[PDB]
Each structure stands twice: as structure tokens, then as C-alpha cells.
């Protein structure tokens, strides 16, 4: 069951969470 | 038909749409331009530093 379970900390990623690059907006608010 | 239809939807067609590339989406905010610590220093005196 490969899935991304809403994990934010990069050092706690497991399973499908490790196959995730960050999505960050490039325009400051 | 005795119920609603497509034309009765308002907020769903007005909110802007953006594409997501993950299950977590990050963004950055700017809150302050600096601390409020006084601007007057005196003649020939180096002013203090500040951080946003």
C-alpha cells in the first residue's frame, strides 16, 4: 500500500512519502 | 426536473483554480518589515540592527 500520508517532516518520511518532492510557491505573499 | 441545476452554483465557479503537484502544498508569507525599536540615534552614532 504505497501512499503519501500527509507527513511534513522530511526525516520522518516512510513508504510512498519518500517519493515526494516539495511543492512550494515561488512568489512571496 | 423539480430540483436545482448547474446555473445555481456560484462560489465553485468564482474561486480561482491552481494545479497541485503533491499532497502537501507549501507557501511563504511576509509578516513584518522589522521590529519597532526606535529610529533616532544621535549625531555620528551607528544605528542598531533590525530583522523582519
Amino acid at each position: 500500500a504505497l501512499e503519501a500520508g500527509h507527513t511534513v517532516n522530511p526525516l520522518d518520511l516512510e513508504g510512498g512519502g519518500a517519493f515526494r518532492v516539495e511543492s512550494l510557491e515561488r512568489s512571496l505573499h | 426536473n423539480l430540483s436545482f441545476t448547474d446555473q445555481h452554483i456560484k462560489f465553485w465557479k468564482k474561486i480561482p483554480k491552481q494545479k497541485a503537484y503533491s499532497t502537501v502544498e507549501q507557501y511563504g508569507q511576509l509578516l513584518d518589515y522589522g521590529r519597532s525599536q526606535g529610529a533616532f540615534v544621535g549625531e555620528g552614532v551607528l544605528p542598531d540592527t533590525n530583522d523582519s
Binding site: - | 518589515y33 522589522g34 540615534v41 533590525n50
Partner: protein
């Protein structure tokens, strides 16, 4: 009746600084130096506006 009065010029200032490694790494929101300069200028503008 006549009178003579005087006014004294006052001084304002602030300091901003950035470490050398901060300029060498990738930045998400453009040049850090320009952003800091803009932040300092806006903070000074607000301080002068409130001191007036």
C-alpha cells in the same frame, strides 16, 4: 511684540546586514539583499510617518 524661535535638526537611521553564506545559497524569492533593502526602507518610512 516680536519673538524669535529656533528649531533643531534631528537624526534617524537603521542598520541591516546579511551573512556571506546567505548570499551563496539558492533563494526562493529572488535576491535577498534587495528584499532586505526594501524592508528597511519601508520600516523607516513607517517610523517617520508615526513620528510626524
Amino acid at each position: 511684540t516680536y519673538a524669535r524661535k529656533a528649531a533643531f535638526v534631528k537624526f534617524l537611521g537603521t542598520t541591516r546586514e546579511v551573512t556571506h553564506p546567505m548570499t551563496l545559497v539558492n533563494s526562493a524569492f529572488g535576491n535577498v539583499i534587495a528584499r532586505q533593502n526594501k524592508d528597511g526602507i519601508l520600516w523607516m518610512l513607517k517610523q517617520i510617518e508615526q513620528a510626524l
